[PDB]
Design a protein around this ligand. Structure first.
Ligand SMILES: NCC[C@@H](O)c1cccc(OCC2CCCCC2)c1
Ligand SMILES: NCC[C@@H](O)c1cccc(OCC2CCCCC2)c1
Ligand SMILES: CCCCCCCCCCCCCCCC(=O)O
Ligand SMILES: CCCCCCCCCCCCCCCC(=O)O
Ligand SMILES: [Fe+2]
Ligand SMILES: [Fe+2]
Lengths: 510, 510
């Protein structure tokens, strides 16, 4: 459908320099007065060290970005995060730490796991942490973008790592998941809010509940998980980490393999009684990176997911050399890739043996099914919410503070065209209506939703996305502000420098 | 969504009497001049013999119906088909032959298989045959509706039975499928067109190709199949016929069971070289009654299906006592039923071992996938074309003569609301747009498409459906003629008597 023959998307993967202090952006249209605060995003900003290239999308050195709405103007600022990976590279003028898809070559100390925090940033107590998916997170300063310290979660709780998508309750309580040793297992970690003593909430971390693993020695790759007021949902996919190959030229990609026969196993745990529920939910194979939202509806959990159909690891398609190709080749490279699809799964909670052989999903407004089998597995089929050929609705966001974990209607997403980000999408998950914002030669980022302080409806607010527009007669980038009702444009804050790709972030209200 | 508290649909399952000669219908609107010919449909018309009830939807005695467009008026006529089942019942004043869900009680001869031809009618040579799904078909007179003879396909070819959905090529060549003995197997039967000798084409029947069965002694129930210019497609579902229980109080329903672990196996055969292709296509469990259309697109077959998600046999929900309940109870009874969904499957024909682990479906306009596994199974996921909660798009029809087996855009269907027929639907299978015709307290039949003789586009024509409208100030039934472009009404031909449910039929042009 939409084509990008000029190859502008290449700019998303080009090195930039940090700034000494904030630039003032030039605003077009009108920024609502109520929008005061800061958009903070992370992504790779350095794609080679001298003449040594990084190879994968997830290898570039973490760059922390900020758009600040204050005092009737908008500023843009970015700084590299002073991780061990980045600081040692700058010192030694080479790739020192092995990244996801780039092995470092040398030139007793133990394996040096990357702390390249390029993926997301989130609050813990009164602090902010940039993260990747390892055991290392980096405390950063949200005002100045200075790097404060490295933290090793292994010093506090028993997990080997943790996702870049913790869930955060309204009181500031933080939940995350990581694999551990139990036999392998997956641990839900909880960090309480800041208390009166003002001591670091991370030092009060604990394990809430443990999920079993389908394979004794091979945990699945986990990228996110679901949380409602009463339940925790974990989706175990057939993308496996081969721990044998892990602990014996290698990078992180080399240790992944796909299990061809397991499909997807879905798991739930009682959040409040802190216990695993032994219901054997089963379905077809897909990769999963992002949960959209999860909620409870009578005796059922509604589990909305951004899926990639198949068991081949989608990250195989995300080496930089492939994302930098010309457009005809980008399309051709995605021909045999897993197909993206938004799916709603419905998990019955009150399972009666007398209904063996039947569909347990008795809700009136879904076509999802769940069949109780005689072996006691529950075989799920989804209701499809969005499906376009090689057109993914990904990097999903909702009105999180008020609708996270609850019944809801709207999701916002980044549209990927053969893996190239080229549109912003709003989905009504009940009616499947969509709204799209797109301009030619414009490559946007994850949309972040900000609620109007006096909102009455779920979509009373704006959506923020950072857009790269390399075209000949163009400011090379801008912050885009859309009305969430219909994705119509409200304002842009343009800047005169490039901005590389970013993955995730937050809006910090002020 | 739409509700039927008055329970008018009960009239669909009420006995009627045959007519001595045609009634003249009263026409409202205007019937196109080009529409000349006859609509012939079959269904049950006698739901009890004296005080002995029939229990299942498929048990009532075959009634042959005709709407005749001739000479600037429309007539309606119906006659019971004088099958052995019907004639013996009328003679003995009781249920003599066991029907699908009604065991006959007595009052050396061999098992007496029903020849109650209530399901469909189709041409063979210059003849027309009413059928069910047994070995017995009944030659009928399309002008007078007289019954001519019983035919036993077992006298001509080696099958135990045959579906009520043969495919008919433009030259009159007839293809069908039935299970047989090979070990059980499934045989494609071919009947040639009428030749110069004028001898009965059925006496020239032969077996073209044989499909293997997933279970040595248990064939799956088969209701229809797919045909393109070069391929035959057969879908083997987990609804099994237990031949053990078959050959040992019993009716046909009692012999069915669901296989919980096989899912669906899809099979193709080279039509012209008459050989089975050994590609092991596999997917999730569903019931299938009706193929919509099948065609070839580069090295792929496109297989569009009306599916019911799950392995429980959907016919369990179609006993007359359940279909006659009040509306709140009808809905409640369908709560745990399989969910209807229209699905497009895509079958790769050129399978390369070097693509093991990847999605082979490289077509640009689909989200269907097919993954080649190391065990050499090919795991399919569908593109969903239509999905509504307990709202089935069923009894599908297309512009068959010109688009059957070929690339196409439009399907027409009967909308079932918790198994109650209450709307007519047109689907664009490429865009997924739909059009609906619905009126309150009106229960339509399968829509049959008739092409304009000077058609330029696929949907240049009309759709015919027989509608029952029992409401207080109403002619109790009518033939509905809709414009196929948008399902807007063109004319009705009303009659002053009831018409019970009909399943399938044809338009015979004249
Ligand atoms: N968000 C994309 C993946 C990226 O954050 C990344 C970059 C570097 C290392 C890494 O490791 C994930 C590992 C978790 C522990 C087990 C091996 C895989 C993951
Ligand atoms: N169209 C609905 C089913 C109906 O035609 C019907 C009515 C009566 C008998 C029957 O038999 C199907 C059998 C095929 C041979 C093996 C057993 C099932 C099927
Ligand atoms: C942000 C656009 C990047 C261009 C490549 C987009 C392809 C993403 C495919 C889905 C995988 C999502 C994993 C990345 C998000 C994360 O690291 O948390
Ligand atoms: C025609 C409306 C009948 C009312 C019940 C409709 C439920 C049909 C469920 C799908 C099964 C289709 C099988 C019947 C068609 C046939 O016998 O060929
Ligand atoms: Fe992510
Ligand atoms: Fe049928």
């Amino acid at each position: 459908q939409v084509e990008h023959p000029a190859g502008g998307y290449k700019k998303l993967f080009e090195t930039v320099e940090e700034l000494s202090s904030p630039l003032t952006a030039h605003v077009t249209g009108r920024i609502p007065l109520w929008l005061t605060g800061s958009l903070l995003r992370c992504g790779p900003g350095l794609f080679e060290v001298g003449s040594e290239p990084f190879y994968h999308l997830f290898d570039g050195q973490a760059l922390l970005h900020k758009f600040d709405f204050k005092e009737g103007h908008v500023t843009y600022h970015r700084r590299f995060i002073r991780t061990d990976a980045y600081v040692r590279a700058m010192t030694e003028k080479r790739i020192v730490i092995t990244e996801f898809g780039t092995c470092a070559f040398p030139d007793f100390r133990g394996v040096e796991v990357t702390d390249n925090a390029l993926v997301n940033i989130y609050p813990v107590g009164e602090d902010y942490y940039a993260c990747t998916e390892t055991n290392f997170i980096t405390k950063v300063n949200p005002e100045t973008l200075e790097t404060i310290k490295q933290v090793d979660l292994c010093n506090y709780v028993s997990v080997n790592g943790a996702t870049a998508h913790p869930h955060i309750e309204n009181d500031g309580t933080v939940y995350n998941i990581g694999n551990c040793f139990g036999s392998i297992a997956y641990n839900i970690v909880k960090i309480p809010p800041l208390q009166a003593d003002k001591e670091d909430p991370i030092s009060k971390s604990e394990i809430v509940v443990q999920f079993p693993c389908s394979d004794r020695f091979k945990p699945s790759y986990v990228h996110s998980f679901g949380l409602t007021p009463n339940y925790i949902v974990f989706v175990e996919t057939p993308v496996k980490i081969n721990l044998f190959k892990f602990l014996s030229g290698a990078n992180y990609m080399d240790c992944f393999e796909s299990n061809e026969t397991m499909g997807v196993w879905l798991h739930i745990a009682d959040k409040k009684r802190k216990k695993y529920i032994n219901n054997k939910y089963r379905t077809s194979p897909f990769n999963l990176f992002h949960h959209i939202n999860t909620y409870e509806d009578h005796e059922f959990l509604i589990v909305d997911l951004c899926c990639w159909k198949g068991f081949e690891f989608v990250y195989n398609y995300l080496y930089l050399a492939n994302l930098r190709e010309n457009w005809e080749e980008v399309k051709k490279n995605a021909r045999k890739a897993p197909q993206p699809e938004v799916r709603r799964y419905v998990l019955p909670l009150n399972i009666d043996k007398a209904d063996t052989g039947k569909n347990l999903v008795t809700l009136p407004n879904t076509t999802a099914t769940a069949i109780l089998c005689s072996d006691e597995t529950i075989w799920l089929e989804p209701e499809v919410l969005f499906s376009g050929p090689r057109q993914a609705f990904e990097f999903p966001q909702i009105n999180y503070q008020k609708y996270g974990g609850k019944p809801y209607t709207y999701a916002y997403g980044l549209g990927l065209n053969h893996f190239v980000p080229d549109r912003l999408c709003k989905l009504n998950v009940k009616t499947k209506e969509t709204w799209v914002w797109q301009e030619p030669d414009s490559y946007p980022s994850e949309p972040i939703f900000v609620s109007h302080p006096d909102a009455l409806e779920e979509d009373d607010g704006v959506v923020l996305s950072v857009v790269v527009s390399p075209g000949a007669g163009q400011k090379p980038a801008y912050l885009l502000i859309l009305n969430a009702k219909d994705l119509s444009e409200v304002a842009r804050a343009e800047v005169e420098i490039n901005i590389p790709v970013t993955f995730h972030g937050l809006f910090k209200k002020s």
